[PDB]
UniProtKB/Swiss-Prot annotation, chains B, C, E:
It is found in: Secreted. Plays diverse functions in immunomodulation and oncogenicity, maybe by acting as a functional receptor for human CSF1. May inhibit interferon secretion from mononuclear cells. Exhibits oncogenic activity in vitro. GO terms for molecular function: identical protein binding. It comes from Epstein-Barr virus (strain B95-8). The keyword Heme does not apply. Phosphorylated on serine and threonine by host. Keywords: Disulfide bond, Early protein, Glycoprotein, Immunoglobulin domain, Oncogene, Repeat, Secreted, Signal. Homohexamer. Interacts with human CSF1. This is Secreted protein BARF1. GO terms for cellular component: extracellular region. Disulfide bonds join C126-C170. Glycans are attached at N75.
């Protein structure tokens, strides 16, 4: 499933076949490296307990034979693989679900003339912030953010006479924006 | 003169025809609201004193008969008029110089999709920060915020229901300065 | 329903006789002072939006024809009445549910002896913290403080001159909830 | 001597026999491990100097041939052994005095029902904070505090049907309180 | 009695002719603005209680028939009058004692040269901090500042154009206390 | 050149002979140990760029064939040697200039009687704060400050009867002040 940052989102699991609902002992885990398990919460007979680190971040519920992991507001740490362990008696079945969290890209353009040796060089900067894959490219004719998003910036230095307009292509997988520097202040 | 934000800048002045160099008493004033003349500093006989509030932000020096007010890193408060008063004995001449401080525009584009009743509405946001005159406008195929640095920000939202009227282009300006941002395709 | 402080809690609602599941527009409201209905969130066609002030604190989901408001960790502000509004076309039905939040009582006993004119007077202090209704009372053989968490504290002092009228028993209550604390012997 | 937390308290020493009052050079030390000496203050000819770390915490004075260490407000760091060194000429006599600081016990009772797998288990918690020796015990039919006191807590888990009332016995040497959980909210 | 800032100090009192030691109820009061008597502490039968606001700052003890109020580290707020009230049965006697707290003066000298129009003017600054009575005066060959500690500071500037009228001597006082600071030669 | 703390100050350099003004590429460096170079700024064709650590602290300019380093407000870190590198083509000439920063001295006198064994000893303290060379000396008949200045203090202990007046001599190279303790409070 794909969620955008801040959106409610849901993963689901079910046992089989097996149609036994509230009798199944359900636990959901967030998977780390290399598939290391961190318990989010447990459900049995429609009594649910969320572990304190995930409280308000995740909930669990049942509808018939389907088990739900709900993410109240997706953030970038929530990206990746989850494990639903379903247990009846001394028997057990696990299912893996994937959540893709996507921060829509922000494309910024800004320019700055040189200050030494003279003021004749226009450096145009193009910045893409996004998740998972920001990408930046100039046409002529990197950093980790507090929220876990990634920023990339590229400078184009332009000797006089300035090759204006220049177009910046920002991408986040299939998402794309352009930034066009058209003319200088002077 | 025009200076971009952060740049070393220079205003200049000289007297005439009067080649007297260090004999001339020079004082530089920042002109305020107002009519008010606020002293930056003085130079005479190659002794330069810069008033405490301006220290580090402005300097004064002479090259022969030319007098210089140096702004060490142009900030938006430095935008406005300046006065160089030159004195010899009982006679004075005054020269008025303008400094334009410009922050080059930053244009940003980003989109967000709707979360209720469904996920079908794209809102695309275009933000221009600049000084003195940011302006933004959406093309198809809200206050001024004052930032900490004195520059001004302006933002416009455009909502697109399905089918998204894509290629949308944002036009940003700051006087003659111009940039665009084009939202081409969503992530899906 | 009754929830202790910190517990996951659930209010439920369904329409009738009307087995329409995802076709029904559900909204949940917290009832305020007041007469005021404050929107927690909405569900329709299995798209759930929780208002920003309630995000993380409440969730909404459906199981077939039953609608659930989940409180993720019951706090004392959550105590009160809730409204589930169910809509189909132009017709609505509304269900009012109550949540009672209870903090289980804490009873504390401690004694302190007098320091002047001498060391012979024992004062024994009994403190009950709970929600909604802490109450304390001393048996032989002062404001309500509002805590940060919304719970209420109540304290009673009993002074005993020599010979100390020991076994003293403190009785603490919170509605039907009951605890005692008995001061048996001093340190000497 | 026994002082309770916050009470003024006094230790005393004297030389012998020897009846020579203000002529004796008196110094008091707080004893650490293993009897390590830390100077509190000195007295001679009724001139007294308290070392800055103990200033406002301790004073010293004389009455005739008796030397006094006064503790202005006993705290738990003041618990333990003190040394009075009494010096006349190149001769010297030391006496050891003991201060017991006692924090009267606080007994707390609180209960909490289980949240998973169901809500049927009552865990009753009984906490004793005290100094020197808090102790807790349940009848059916650990941590160090900022002020230097010690807290101990014990949980009794009760399956349904709840074995109510349960009585908690708190002790601090001979000090004793009981905590009785009598009935649940529901 | 006189105590310098930071010193252990003692006021004393006794009754008469009345050799009753521990039988006497003693209380010590700090006298305020005002006419107001503020209780420091009490002693009776060798039980001493010091009021919470004075704890650590003052103590009381007895040696036979003499009663002592000990100030553990004299501060400037301790300067003023004190009352020892001695009681036996229904009869009382009261003794008034004065504590003078003195901060010994600090005298500082420093010079600064002028920066405009030239470097030829020396200003020499002399600062006296003390309690109760700092005073400063320049000899040839402006408020009181209240410091955090209750002491008082006083500063005088003397400008000297070339040729500098050197040996200049600063005279500092605090009642009978006296110090000088002499500026002898500049750095050049 | 000598500057006092807080004063504007100037260093100058020139190439030769060579009379070619704005054609020369000028860079000024602050010298550390052992002559390590830290760039302050560069000038060429009367375009000047000051490096951000020195911005508002230093400026550079030309008057004809003379190159100026200006220090806007001298502080103690600015004390020591500077290097002017002057470059034309692949040829280069460097000149060393020295700035002496001087904090005028502050002489303080204060006295304090003993507190143990009795109150009969007058300790008079004399403190000189200065830069570069504070010095203190008592006549009978060390520390580094936040601003980089140096403080030195000397105590004179005086048994009764007090040898008053005592005179303190403060020096900072040729700068000199005296402090005279003339009489006690009591
Ligand atoms: C993204 O979501 C994750 C949860 O899935 C967020 O992490 C959680 O953040 C909370 C709030 O900080 C953590 O609780 C803090 O814990 C420490 C004790 O270790 C304590 O000092 C605080 O009072 C508070 O309880 C919680 O442990 C943590 N959960 C996990 C599983 O890491 C993350 O902060 C979210 N936001 C962003 C922007 O990433
Ligand atoms: C833009 O440049 C102006 C200066 O031309 C900057 O203003 C000056 O700012 C400094 C603080 O860095 C002020 O110095 C402070 O003044 C207070 C107020 O009396 C004093 O308490 C402090 O110790 C300190 O000296 C200075 O007076 C002020 N000068 C003016 C306004 O003429 C301004 O900070 C810069 N703005 C930005 C956004 O960088
Ligand atoms: C008990 O639960 C209620 C929620 O049902 C908690 O109140 C909510 O508390 C949060 C803060 O954690 C508020 O979010 C903040 O609001 C301010 C004000 O506009 C905003 O500046 C912050 O950025 C942040 O979003 C939220 O609005 C508020 N919701 C309400 C009152 O409906 C409350 O904090 C909990 N109380 C305790 C004692 O835990
Ligand atoms: C219990 O009583 C002892 C004294 O018998 C208390 O310790 C003393 O606490 C004072 C106040 O903190 C200490 O003075 C601090 O010293 C540091 C320098 O090391 C400085 O940063 C502060 O301005 C202040 O002077 C004092 O040194 C310390 N004395 C000893 C002998 O340790 C203890 O704090 C008392 N209270 C409790 C609750 O334990
Ligand atoms: C000089 O000595 C006097 C005492 O004789 C000092 O005043 C006392 O100062 C303490 C604080 O260290 C006060 O204790 C505090 O009072 C507040 C106010 O109610 C309370 O919130 C705090 O928890 C704390 O107990 C005390 O009441 C006060 N006594 C008085 C004024 O009689 C004073 O601090 C000393 N001054 C200097 C400059 O050292
Ligand atoms: C004496 O003058 C020197 C400069 O010649 C002063 O040093 C400079 O001080 C500024 C202001 O702190 C430094 O900029 C700080 O840099 C850090 C990053 O490393 C950043 O956290 C701050 O926002 C700020 O930019 C500057 O780097 C430093 N320059 C040098 C060459 O060291 C010194 O502070 C002056 N004053 C005194 C009393 O010494
Ligand atoms: Pt996916
Ligand atoms: Pt970044
Ligand atoms: Pt010239
Ligand atoms: Pt803004
Ligand atoms: Pt369904
Ligand atoms: Pt309270
Ligand atoms: Pt003992
Ligand atoms: Pt604890
Ligand atoms: Pt006695
Ligand atoms: Pt002051
Ligand atoms: Pt020099
Ligand atoms: Pt120092």
């Amino acid at each position: 499933v794909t969620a955008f940052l801040g959106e409610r989102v849901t993963l689901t699991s079910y046992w089989r076949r097996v149609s036994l609902g509230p009798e199944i002992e359900v636990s959901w885990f967030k998977l780390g490296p290399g598939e290391e398990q961190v318990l989010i919460g447990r459900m049995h007979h429609d009594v649910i307990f969320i572990e304190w680190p995930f409280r308000g971040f995740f909930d669990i519920h049942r509808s018939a034979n389907t088990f739900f992991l709900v993410v109240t507001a997706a953030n970038i740490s929530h990206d990746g693989n989850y494990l639903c362990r379903m247990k009846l008696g001394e028997t057990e079945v696990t299912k893996q679900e994937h959540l893709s969290v996507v921060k829509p890209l922000t494309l910024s353009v800004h320019s700055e003339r040189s200050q030494f040796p003279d003021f004749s060089v226009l450096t145009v900067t193009c910045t893409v912030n996004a998740f998972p894959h920001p990408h930046v490219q100039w046409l002529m004719p990197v950093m980790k953010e507090k929220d876990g998003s990634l920023s990339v910036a590229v400078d184009l230095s332009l000797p006089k006479p300035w090759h204006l307009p220049v177009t910046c292509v920002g991408k986040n997988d299939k998402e794309e924006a352009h930034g066009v520097y058209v003319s200088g202040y002077l």
